[PDB]
Design a protein around this ligand. Structure first.
Ligand SMILES: CNc1nc(Cl)nc2c1ncn2CC1CCCCC1
Length: 164
């Protein structure tokens, strides 16, 4: 069902994560971690303290799709087990240094064609697929976007709920 999902998304905040490659999203799915540039790192740390759930919605550049969504379970932390991110051009490991822990809610894809009816008030009401890495998605748009993803029956939201 979708009832526990709706509960997790209640009063949540939503951010679009744009990854330059599939490898880092796969690593994030395997390890439950994400790192972003310092500007977005600061925003996400602020958001984590402000809301019951902060949801990252992932999209790989040029894929035409979202690859799933996850809930922040921590603020960023430095000095843990290093993450072997594939670094884009001009990108260094220092600027990906803070690691957030995340719990995946959905690891399934959603093509942009299915979200064409959703616009984001915080990005000039452009289609929600449009946005730079870190763009915040307004509550109603973000909730409806997450509800469009195919259910991920491999995930049990019970433990996620027991962290809010
Ligand atoms: C593990 N984190 C990331 N991995 C990858 Cl491949 N791309 C990312 C990541 N965070 C943001 N982006 C997109 C930006 C776009 C501007 C230039 C630098 C990259």
């Amino acid at each position: 069902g979708t009832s526990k999902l709706k509960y997790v998304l209640q009063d949540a905040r939503f951010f679009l994560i744009k990854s330059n490659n599939h490898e880092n999203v796969s690593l994030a799915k395997a390890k439950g971690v994400w790192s972003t540039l310092p500007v977005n790192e600061k925003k996400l740390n602020l958001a984590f303290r402000s809301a019951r759930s902060v949801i990252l919605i992932f999209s790989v550049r040029e894929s035409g799709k979202f690859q799933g969504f996850a809930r922040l379970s921590s603020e960023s932390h430095h000095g843990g087990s290093p993450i072997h991110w594939v670094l884009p051009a001009g990108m260094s490991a220092k600027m990906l240094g803070g690691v957030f822990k995340i719990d995946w809610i959905c690891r399934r894809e959603l093509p942009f064609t299915k979200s064409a009816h959703l616009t984001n008030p915080w990005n000039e009401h452009k289609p929600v697929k449009i946005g730079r890495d870190g763009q915040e998605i307004e509550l109603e748009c973000g909730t409806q976007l997450c509800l469009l993803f195919p259910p991920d029956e491999s995930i049990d939201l019970y433990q996620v709920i027991h962290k809010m």
